[PDB]
């Protein structure tokens, strides 16, 4: 009913209720603007720049922007007014000067935040395009910057923007791709069209809602595509001239570039220079505009991207029609990832298992890998949403997957795309923070975009909604407004059992072929005399209610669960000088009762014998025993964990070859290893009643994954066990699978495939925390914020 008027309502902040016509920055996208929105709100006359001949003009309200004497008080000068007309310098030409305190006009309650978001802005543009982005380069060198910022998977636009807004993984906020089917709604979300505007898609609590609920006003973050960038900037600057009670504190600008051009020309196409220059000019308009309003040393500015851009061409397409015969029985969500479901829920013939097998290791250079979603690397956090299809294809960088060839030429055109694994270098994007609350001329390590919501909340004095950030992990970006987290309280205290059972009380079906001076010696070991060597950062805290025992040994310490009948964690240190040994022949099948732990709270060997699929391994490796006599400890029933034979090939190579390799490279390592149970693929520790698989005929639960946390000194001139300073960590969460179908070269020696598997399943310590309910690094000499940053670190193994 577009017969209302936008008079005095241009870019109004409260969108008004149909069937009244709209005047807000999204009205165009809903074809809902008042009849006079273009005439009143999208003025273009005379362009965007003051010229010497306009200086002091008589106000003409038709002009896009003003060069009249009254313009600063009206808040609608062209951004270069003071430069052209009052002998001022452009912001970019001014020296960098530290902003120690906010320098704001009277009536400003808090420094505003402006988020300048750029689509497709790959991390390496900051160096490669530096010659043509002076304004961006100044923000970067004068403020706080990371070398790169890691997006979420899939590295598509809307999943990443909404992660920036919420602090949530896509599985949690519900925007899991740029297209989706929700079976509960029976409804589809797409880029083109109207369903995507329905609020039921968008979960969690985005920043503008967090602000509004807590009494902080927000500019609307979404801009209709036809609103020119110059008008977006002028609109933000006009909002910043509103009266105190009406003026927002948080704003977002968005640019569709350089993504738009990158899809057409590739990430480094010669055509990409111009888009980067134009974005830089837009940054210059904002900063000049702020300087005119005396806000350039008041506002915090974030310059942030959603994802990068890779070289991708029509010819690098894999076709499912080359693998499946049944291609017409499937629906594929295609491109830089694949998602497969049945075309018809009425076809009881459709079988996921046969589709996976037809797609598994079928061609020698296959450029995609199929996964059941629960088997994807846990670091992707891409499974716990009904909108994510059970079958997933992880597509190699530089490739696409499509159903049939005709999908690719009845839809070559494009040279860039994005969407791949969020570890891929080409997908990485940018972060710069500039302002009073950010640090001065500071470089920070790369971090994940899920962390920024918390920081944006800190910048605005908001309490964040519950999210997947680790609040405090990015305190090192900030001068002020830091978040002083406290360590979580331990919920369960350990028991410390001594010797309480005789050997003959155990009827576990286990067998094992097994002085006065050093009788005392091994008593001391069982009492924890070496514990300072093997437990370097304190005992992990158990953050849930359970029954567990601390068990000391010469070579390792463990926290042994009476409920799960195995360790929650096993901690050991391997020095650079440590020697690897074999398992002696007489000890091959040795398993020994632990006289500290009751038979009723022990595993038993007969279950493993009876279970024809399931074998066992050990958490502390027998290969790394300090002495023949200490080795006996490694065969305790309390150190045993269930392992499929296929997995034991992985585990044995880790333990026998790789731990020593890491100790020699890193100058000793401390290893914490353990099981993980995540049968409902939610990324969170399972309770006992969630476990779907036990060792046959027993109560021994089968892990879904095995973790290790491998810590050393960041200054590798110091040994892991005498480190005075910051730590270095790498971790993994390996899937506990009955086959090695994930690894196409698994018929070869482990030296050819195991380490590449482990790299794909790299993890953060925080990922393991979620999955175990344990809290690590509780007793270090480091600040808690520093430890939070360490727990969020991901070792990516990119070149
Ligand atoms: C990343 O950070 C996020 C945020 O902190 C973490 O997610 C939280 O995890 C908690 C545990 O999984 C979860 O708590 C549950 O929430 C239920 C209430 O849910 C609604 O209310 C909140 C508050 O406003 C809201 O945010 C929720 O939003 C979800 O759902 C809507 C769709 O309806 C979406 O729009 C939105 O995108 C979001 O979806 C995501 O989460 C849901 C689960 O809530 C998933 O199913 C989706 O796939 C998607 O990931 C909701 O609108 C509450 O009812 C639960 O309480 C039950 O659960 C346990 C027992 O299981 C018990 O304590 C209770 O007694 C109760 O049991 C009864 O219900 C059971 C389940 O039906 C039933 O089986 C029993 O038999 C009983 O009847 C529970 O508290 C919290 O909602 C989410 N929040 C978000 C935003 O996702 C996430 O874990 C972090 N990730 C990692 C890896 O760390
Ligand atoms: O595509 C976009 C679009 C527009 N405006 C924006 N603005 C960004 C700025 C920002 C910053 C953060 Cl921190 C977080 C979020 Cl969610 C956002 C949204 N994004 C996309 N438009 C809206 C109409 C269409 C064309 O297809 C849909
Ligand atoms: Ca994008
Ligand atoms: Ca779980
Ligand atoms: K067996
Ligand atoms: Na294989
Ligand atoms: Zn794109």
GROMACS .gro file of C-alpha atoms in nm, residues 435-747:
model
  313
  435UNK     CA    1   3.992   0.298   1.781
  436UNK     CA    2   4.029   0.399   2.148
  437UNK     CA    3   3.935   0.053   2.276
  438UNK     CA    4   4.171  -0.139   2.045
  439UNK     CA    5   4.546  -0.152   2.090
  440UNK     CA    6   4.789   0.072   1.905
  441UNK     CA    7   5.017  -0.066   1.624
  442UNK     CA    8   4.961  -0.421   1.754
  443UNK     CA    9   4.970  -0.751   1.564
  444UNK     CA   10   4.774  -1.038   1.717
  445UNK     CA   11   4.778  -1.404   1.621
  446UNK     CA   12   4.515  -1.543   1.376
  447UNK     CA   13   4.185  -1.624   1.549
  448UNK     CA   14   3.843  -1.764   1.459
  449UNK     CA   15   3.553  -1.545   1.365
  450UNK     CA   16   3.331  -1.714   1.629
  451UNK     CA   17   3.529  -1.509   1.887
  452UNK     CA   18   3.434  -1.165   1.758
  453UNK     CA   19   3.073  -1.146   1.892
  454UNK     CA   20   3.208  -1.148   2.251
  455UNK     CA   21   3.457  -0.868   2.165
  456UNK     CA   22   3.192  -0.661   1.995
  457UNK     CA   23   2.977  -0.704   2.311
  458UNK     CA   24   3.281  -0.596   2.524
  459UNK     CA   25   3.324  -0.287   2.298
  460UNK     CA   26   2.957  -0.186   2.362
  461UNK     CA   27   2.941  -0.284   2.733
  462UNK     CA   28   2.697  -0.569   2.658
  463UNK     CA   29   2.664  -0.905   2.821
  464UNK     CA   30   2.692  -1.156   2.535
  465UNK     CA   31   2.425  -1.417   2.476
  466UNK     CA   32   2.552  -1.777   2.517
  467UNK     CA   33   2.782  -1.849   2.225
  468UNK     CA   34   3.072  -2.059   2.095
  469UNK     CA   35   3.343  -1.800   2.155
  470UNK     CA   36   3.570  -1.837   2.456
  471UNK     CA   37   3.524  -1.502   2.629
  472UNK     CA   38   3.861  -1.365   2.728
  473UNK     CA   39   4.053  -1.539   2.451
  474UNK     CA   40   4.070  -1.209   2.253
  475UNK     CA   41   4.143  -0.979   2.550
  476UNK     CA   42   4.487  -0.918   2.401
  477UNK     CA   43   4.322  -0.718   2.117
  478UNK     CA   44   4.193  -0.457   2.364
  479UNK     CA   45   4.341  -0.166   2.552
  480UNK     CA   46   4.039  -0.141   2.788
  481UNK     CA   47   3.701  -0.323   2.835
  482UNK     CA   48   3.878  -0.659   2.888
  483UNK     CA   49   3.673  -0.950   3.013
  484UNK     CA   50   3.817  -1.096   3.333
  485UNK     CA   51   3.702  -1.459   3.319
  486UNK     CA   52   3.744  -1.694   3.617
  487UNK     CA   53   3.834  -2.062   3.580
  488UNK     CA   54   3.532  -2.293   3.607
  489UNK     CA   55   3.489  -2.463   3.944
  490UNK     CA   56   3.584  -2.835   3.963
  491UNK     CA   57   3.263  -3.033   4.014
  492UNK     CA   58   3.399  -3.378   4.100
  493UNK     CA   59   3.693  -3.435   4.330
  494UNK     CA   60   3.908  -3.742   4.257
  495UNK     CA   61   3.958  -4.042   4.484
  496UNK     CA   62   4.321  -4.142   4.550
  497UNK     CA   63   4.305  -4.523   4.595
  498UNK     CA   64   4.584  -4.722   4.744
  499UNK     CA   65   4.632  -5.098   4.725
  500UNK     CA   66   4.295  -5.249   4.823
  501UNK     CA   67   4.251  -5.576   4.622
  502UNK     CA   68   4.436  -5.903   4.601
  503UNK     CA   69   4.520  -6.044   4.258
  504UNK     CA   70   4.293  -6.347   4.306
  505UNK     CA   71   3.980  -6.128   4.352
  506UNK     CA   72   3.993  -6.049   3.980
  507UNK     CA   73   3.838  -6.285   3.735
  508UNK     CA   74   3.883  -6.083   3.418
  509UNK     CA   75   4.016  -6.352   3.180
  510UNK     CA   76   4.343  -6.158   3.156
  511UNK     CA   77   4.689  -6.317   3.163
  512UNK     CA   78   5.032  -6.165   3.185
  513UNK     CA   79   5.378  -6.334   3.198
  514UNK     CA   80   5.487  -6.155   3.526
  515UNK     CA   81   6.466  -5.617   4.578
  516UNK     CA   82   6.459  -5.421   4.913
  517UNK     CA   83   6.667  -5.108   4.805
  518UNK     CA   84   6.405  -5.006   4.539
  519UNK     CA   85   6.088  -5.159   4.686
  520UNK     CA   86   6.057  -4.812   4.854
  521UNK     CA   87   6.127  -4.652   4.513
  522UNK     CA   88   5.817  -4.794   4.327
  523UNK     CA   89   5.591  -4.726   4.633
  524UNK     CA   90   5.692  -4.356   4.597
  525UNK     CA   91   5.603  -4.368   4.221
  526UNK     CA   92   5.255  -4.518   4.296
  527UNK     CA   93   5.215  -4.230   4.551
  528UNK     CA   94   5.290  -3.959   4.289
  529UNK     CA   95   5.670  -3.881   4.332
  530UNK     CA   96   5.717  -3.833   3.948
  531UNK     CA   97   5.381  -3.654   3.908
  532UNK     CA   98   5.550  -3.310   3.864
  533UNK     CA   99   5.729  -3.442   3.558
  534UNK     CA  100   5.422  -3.606   3.391
  535UNK     CA  101   5.152  -3.362   3.498
  536UNK     CA  102   5.298  -3.025   3.399
  537UNK     CA  103   4.993  -2.796   3.403
  538UNK     CA  104   4.797  -2.935   3.695
  539UNK     CA  105   4.532  -3.212   3.700
  540UNK     CA  106   4.250  -3.139   3.451
  541UNK     CA  107   3.932  -3.036   3.635
  542UNK     CA  108   3.623  -3.253   3.594
  543UNK     CA  109   3.332  -3.012   3.532
  544UNK     CA  110   3.048  -3.256   3.584
  545UNK     CA  111   2.938  -3.503   3.859
  546UNK     CA  112   3.112  -3.842   3.830
  547UNK     CA  113   3.323  -4.097   4.019
  548UNK     CA  114   3.687  -4.114   3.927
  549UNK     CA  115   4.025  -4.204   4.067
  550UNK     CA  116   4.369  -4.053   4.023
  551UNK     CA  117   4.625  -4.325   3.947
  552UNK     CA  118   4.998  -4.249   3.970
  553UNK     CA  119   5.276  -4.436   3.791
  554UNK     CA  120   5.645  -4.392   3.715
  555UNK     CA  121   5.582  -4.282   3.360
  556UNK     CA  122   5.225  -4.143   3.352
  557UNK     CA  123   4.932  -4.024   3.563
  558UNK     CA  124   4.565  -4.087   3.485
  559UNK     CA  125   4.216  -3.989   3.587
  560UNK     CA  126   4.029  -4.323   3.581
  561UNK     CA  127   3.650  -4.322   3.547
  562UNK     CA  128   3.466  -4.582   3.756
  563UNK     CA  129   3.156  -4.517   3.540
  564UNK     CA  130   3.314  -4.549   3.190
  565UNK     CA  131   3.576  -4.813   3.313
  566UNK     CA  132   3.863  -4.632   3.152
  567UNK     CA  133   4.066  -4.311   3.188
  568UNK     CA  134   3.907  -3.975   3.108
  569UNK     CA  135   4.265  -3.852   3.060
  570UNK     CA  136   4.619  -3.993   3.072
  571UNK     CA  137   4.913  -3.746   3.111
  572UNK     CA  138   5.279  -3.818   3.035
  573UNK     CA  139   5.594  -3.632   2.939
  574UNK     CA  140   5.846  -3.749   2.679
  575UNK     CA  141   6.180  -3.572   2.682
  576UNK     CA  142   6.390  -3.509   2.371
  577UNK     CA  143   6.633  -3.779   2.495
  578UNK     CA  144   6.361  -4.046   2.550
  579UNK     CA  145   6.415  -4.383   2.393
  580UNK     CA  146   6.152  -4.593   2.212
  581UNK     CA  147   6.143  -4.964   2.289
  582UNK     CA  148   5.935  -5.257   2.175
  583UNK     CA  149   5.674  -5.458   2.348
  584UNK     CA  150   5.871  -5.769   2.457
  585UNK     CA  151   5.745  -6.099   2.303
  586UNK     CA  152   5.646  -6.247   2.642
  587UNK     CA  153   5.427  -5.932   2.709
  588UNK     CA  154   5.240  -5.917   2.370
  589UNK     CA  155   4.898  -6.012   2.519
  590UNK     CA  156   4.977  -5.903   2.875
  591UNK     CA  157   4.692  -5.731   3.070
  592UNK     CA  158   4.734  -5.689   3.448
  593UNK     CA  159   4.471  -5.627   3.719
  594UNK     CA  160   4.514  -5.296   3.901
  595UNK     CA  161   4.504  -5.369   4.274
  596UNK     CA  162   4.396  -5.006   4.338
  597UNK     CA  163   4.068  -5.051   4.147
  598UNK     CA  164   3.793  -5.299   4.223
  599UNK     CA  165   3.714  -5.587   3.984
  600UNK     CA  166   3.362  -5.438   3.949
  601UNK     CA  167   3.509  -5.109   3.818
  602UNK     CA  168   3.752  -5.279   3.577
  603UNK     CA  169   3.740  -5.387   3.215
  604UNK     CA  170   3.790  -5.762   3.142
  605UNK     CA  171   3.984  -5.940   2.868
  606UNK     CA  172   3.715  -6.200   2.796
  607UNK     CA  173   3.480  -5.937   2.653
  608UNK     CA  174   3.752  -5.841   2.403
  609UNK     CA  175   3.809  -6.207   2.316
  610UNK     CA  176   3.435  -6.261   2.260
  611UNK     CA  177   3.393  -5.937   2.059
  612UNK     CA  178   3.521  -6.037   1.721
  613UNK     CA  179   3.517  -5.677   1.585
  614UNK     CA  180   3.673  -5.498   1.886
  615UNK     CA  181   4.035  -5.508   2.007
  616UNK     CA  182   4.217  -5.289   2.264
  617UNK     CA  183   4.500  -5.043   2.295
  618UNK     CA  184   4.663  -4.843   2.567
  619UNK     CA  185   4.653  -4.477   2.645
  620UNK     CA  186   5.010  -4.448   2.786
  621UNK     CA  187   5.218  -4.625   2.519
  622UNK     CA  188   5.424  -4.931   2.631
  623UNK     CA  189   5.680  -4.823   2.367
  624UNK     CA  190   5.779  -4.519   2.569
  625UNK     CA  191   5.836  -4.685   2.908
  626UNK     CA  192   6.129  -4.540   3.106
  627UNK     CA  193   6.262  -4.894   3.191
  628UNK     CA  194   6.176  -5.261   3.149
  629UNK     CA  195   6.028  -5.267   3.497
  630UNK     CA  196   5.817  -4.947   3.445
  631UNK     CA  197   5.680  -5.103   3.128
  632UNK     CA  198   5.465  -5.344   3.337
  633UNK     CA  199   5.261  -5.039   3.449
  634UNK     CA  200   5.160  -4.976   3.084
  635UNK     CA  201   4.979  -5.311   3.069
  636UNK     CA  202   4.749  -5.232   3.360
  637UNK     CA  203   4.383  -5.298   3.285
  638UNK     CA  204   4.330  -4.934   3.397
  639UNK     CA  205   4.541  -4.809   3.097
  640UNK     CA  206   4.340  -5.020   2.837
  641UNK     CA  207   4.082  -4.873   2.599
  642UNK     CA  208   3.869  -5.034   2.327
  643UNK     CA  209   4.004  -5.004   1.976
  644UNK     CA  210   3.900  -5.144   1.642
  645UNK     CA  211   4.194  -5.317   1.468
  646UNK     CA  212   4.174  -5.071   1.182
  647UNK     CA  213   4.217  -4.784   1.433
  648UNK     CA  214   4.501  -4.958   1.617
  649UNK     CA  215   4.709  -4.916   1.301
  650UNK     CA  216   4.662  -4.542   1.339
  651UNK     CA  217   4.714  -4.534   1.716
  652UNK     CA  218   5.021  -4.760   1.720
  653UNK     CA  219   5.194  -4.543   1.461
  654UNK     CA  220   5.112  -4.226   1.659
  655UNK     CA  221   5.245  -4.382   1.978
  656UNK     CA  222   5.545  -4.573   1.838
  657UNK     CA  223   5.672  -4.317   1.581
  658UNK     CA  224   5.509  -3.979   1.609
  659UNK     CA  225   5.524  -3.897   1.978
  660UNK     CA  226   5.904  -3.947   1.971
  661UNK     CA  227   5.924  -3.742   1.651
  662UNK     CA  228   5.742  -3.457   1.817
  663UNK     CA  229   5.957  -3.474   2.131
  664UNK     CA  230   6.271  -3.451   1.923
  665UNK     CA  231   6.136  -3.159   1.709
  666UNK     CA  232   5.983  -2.963   1.999
  667UNK     CA  233   6.241  -3.041   2.270
  668UNK     CA  234   6.018  -3.272   2.473
  669UNK     CA  235   5.639  -3.287   2.480
  670UNK     CA  236   5.375  -3.338   2.736
  671UNK     CA  237   5.090  -3.560   2.606
  672UNK     CA  238   4.738  -3.583   2.744
  673UNK     CA  239   4.533  -3.855   2.570
  674UNK     CA  240   4.188  -3.997   2.623
  675UNK     CA  241   3.855  -4.117   2.486
  676UNK     CA  242   3.564  -3.909   2.359
  677UNK     CA  243   3.195  -4.019   2.338
  678UNK     CA  244   2.982  -3.810   2.110
  679UNK     CA  245   2.719  -4.045   1.972
  680UNK     CA  246   2.465  -3.760   1.912
  681UNK     CA  247   2.730  -3.550   1.725
  682UNK     CA  248   2.650  -3.234   1.925
  683UNK     CA  249   3.015  -3.155   2.007
  684UNK     CA  250   2.946  -3.215   2.377
  685UNK     CA  251   3.036  -3.489   2.621
  686UNK     CA  252   2.784  -3.776   2.622
  687UNK     CA  253   2.618  -3.891   2.933
  688UNK     CA  254   2.628  -4.269   2.988
  689UNK     CA  255   2.269  -4.314   2.860
  690UNK     CA  256   2.368  -4.170   2.521
  691UNK     CA  257   2.621  -4.442   2.439
  692UNK     CA  258   2.519  -4.655   2.144
  693UNK     CA  259   2.794  -4.921   2.139
  694UNK     CA  260   2.959  -5.135   2.408
  695UNK     CA  261   3.221  -5.408   2.385
  696UNK     CA  262   3.010  -5.716   2.328
  697UNK     CA  263   2.857  -5.860   2.645
  698UNK     CA  264   3.002  -5.592   2.871
  699UNK     CA  265   2.943  -5.247   3.010
  700UNK     CA  266   3.266  -5.115   2.847
  701UNK     CA  267   3.153  -4.815   2.632
  702UNK     CA  268   3.310  -4.764   2.293
  703UNK     CA  269   3.455  -4.417   2.225
  704UNK     CA  270   3.356  -4.233   1.907
  705UNK     CA  271   3.698  -4.058   1.906
  706UNK     CA  272   4.043  -4.053   2.068
  707UNK     CA  273   4.211  -3.720   2.154
  708UNK     CA  274   4.564  -3.607   2.229
  709UNK     CA  275   4.684  -3.266   2.352
  710UNK     CA  276   5.056  -3.222   2.285
  711UNK     CA  277   5.215  -2.935   2.471
  712UNK     CA  278   5.573  -2.795   2.475
  713UNK     CA  279   5.763  -2.471   2.535
  714UNK     CA  280   5.701  -2.194   2.273
  715UNK     CA  281   6.076  -2.123   2.315
  716UNK     CA  282   6.197  -2.461   2.205
  717UNK     CA  283   6.545  -2.390   2.353
  718UNK     CA  284   6.383  -2.488   2.680
  719UNK     CA  285   6.267  -2.843   2.744
  720UNK     CA  286   5.891  -2.907   2.781
  721UNK     CA  287   5.938  -2.993   3.150
  722UNK     CA  288   6.136  -2.673   3.239
  723UNK     CA  289   5.959  -2.403   3.037
  724UNK     CA  290   5.963  -2.055   3.195
  725UNK     CA  291   5.733  -1.883   2.945
  726UNK     CA  292   5.450  -1.924   2.693
  727UNK     CA  293   5.338  -2.268   2.572
  728UNK     CA  294   5.299  -2.424   2.230
  729UNK     CA  295   5.018  -2.680   2.168
  730UNK     CA  296   4.889  -2.907   1.893
  731UNK     CA  297   4.593  -3.138   1.938
  732UNK     CA  298   4.375  -3.387   1.753
  733UNK     CA  299   4.043  -3.566   1.779
  734UNK     CA  300   4.078  -3.881   1.576
  735UNK     CA  301   3.761  -4.067   1.469
  736UNK     CA  302   3.746  -4.417   1.619
  737UNK     CA  303   3.639  -4.601   1.301
  738UNK     CA  304   3.628  -4.974   1.217
  739UNK     CA  305   3.779  -4.916   0.871
  740UNK     CA  306   4.028  -4.679   0.716
  741UNK     CA  307   3.801  -4.599   0.419
  742UNK     CA  308   3.861  -4.228   0.485
  743UNK     CA  309   4.224  -4.279   0.393
  744UNK     CA  310   4.246  -4.386   0.024
  745UNK     CA  311   4.616  -4.493   0.064
  746UNK     CA  312   4.561  -4.698   0.384
  747UNK     CA  313   4.683  -5.025   0.220
   0.00000   0.00000   0.00000
